[PDB]
Amino acid sequence: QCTVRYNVADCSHLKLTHIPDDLPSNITVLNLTHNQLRRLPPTNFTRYSQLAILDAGFNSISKLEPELCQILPLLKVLNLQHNELSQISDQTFVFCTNLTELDLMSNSIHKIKSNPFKNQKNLIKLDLSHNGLSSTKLGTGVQLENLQELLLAKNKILALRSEELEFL
RNA sequence: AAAAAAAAAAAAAAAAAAAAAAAAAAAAAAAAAAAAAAAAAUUUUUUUUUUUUUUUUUUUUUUUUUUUUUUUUUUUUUUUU
Ligand SMILES: *[C@@H]1O[C@H](CO)[C@@H](O)[C@H](O)[C@H]1NC(C)=O
């Protein structure tokens, strides 16, 4: 099974077909990286309500439900790089107000519409790379009050314009 | 038909860090060798220059004995010119 070992559920290569929910729910760090994930269930995380951060990376997730942002209000790091994530919207980030770290290294998110990060105020680092972005625009209004580094690499942006960089 | 995430096999090529070895070369340290050389301590050869002892040849010198001649100073005696 997983490692636990004082609140670091580092679940290595273990042929875990489904997301487990074991007795040691009193942990803060959980790692779903390198685990067979069909999708993140909006209700299977009720047992683990103390997860400060979750390392659910490189998995196979079609889309993210908004409920995941309210089942774990105390969420800091959301490392979900190398997933399918064909399309995403702001609705799934409504309740993620405490989010501080985002990692999306391969998701093929070609088009981004509206303001997906209208509720993210403590989000520091943005990792949106190799997702085939054609433009650097992320919205029309002013958001991202407190962020430090913006990662937009390996995408297909053709030019930078004043109208698409005025959202900050 | 095509593109991608987790899970599993992998064959090839380019690189590397190690272990077990093996020839080759080069460094030394010990056992020998063949010699062209070097002394030293025991035998002795040839040759040159010189010392001592002993046996003898030639020449010279001294003394003694014997003997032949040139000179002799004496003549005891003998017949005399
Ligand atoms: C969520 O939990 C249920 C009950 O254990 C399980 O059948 C299901 O597979 C879980 N979800 C995923 C995506 O595995």
Nearest ligand 1 atom to the CA of A18 is 14
Nucleotides of chain B in contact with protein CB (under 7 A) are 4-8
The CA–C1' separation of A129 and B81, in angstroms, is 212
Buried b (16+ CB within 10 A) or exposed e, A23-52: eeeebbbbbbbbbebeebbbeebeebeebe
Distance, in Å, from the CA atom of A86 to the CA atom of A112, rounded to the nearest integer, reads: 11
Technique employed here was cryo-EM
The CA–C1' separation of A136 and B42, in angstroms, is 117
Distance, in Å, from the CA atom of A73 to the CA atom of A22, rounded to the nearest integer, reads: 21
Q: Which helix (H) or strand (E) holds A127?
A: strand A125-128
Yes or no: say if A37 and A31 are a contact pair by the CB < 8 Å rule: no
Residue A152 has which token pair? Answer: 């937009």
> Among positive and negative, which fits the CA dihedral A164, A108, A119, A26?
negative
Ligand 1 pocket member A20 (CB < 6 A): no
Distance, in Å, from the CA atom of A101 to the CA atom of A120, rounded to the nearest integer, reads: 10
Distance, in Å, from the CA atom of A115 to the CA atom of A91, rounded to the nearest integer, reads: 10
* Annotated resolution, angstroms: 3.2
Yes or no: say if A68 and A45 are a contact pair by the CB < 8 Å rule: yes
Reference A67, options A98, A33, A49, A91; nearest CA is A91
Q: What does each C-alpha distance from A125 to A32, A77, A163 come to in angstroms?
A: 21, 10, 22
Which bin fits A2, alpha (ψ -120 to 50), beta or left (φ > 0)?
Answer: beta
Yes or no: say if A51 and A29 are a contact pair by the CB < 8 Å rule: yes
Instruction: Name the strands in the sheet holding A77-79, side by side, starting at the edge strand that comes first in the sequence.
Output: A8-10, A29-31, A53-55, A77-79, A101-104, A125-128, A149-151
* SS3 track for A60-113: CCCCCCCHHHHHCCCCCEEECCCCCCCCCCCHHHCCCCCCCEEEECCCCCCCCC
Distance, in Å, from the CA atom of A139 to the CA atom of A71, rounded to the nearest integer, reads: 27
Residue A106 has which token pair? Answer: 């391969």
Distance, in Å, from the CA atom of A101 to the CA atom of A160, rounded to the nearest integer, reads: 25
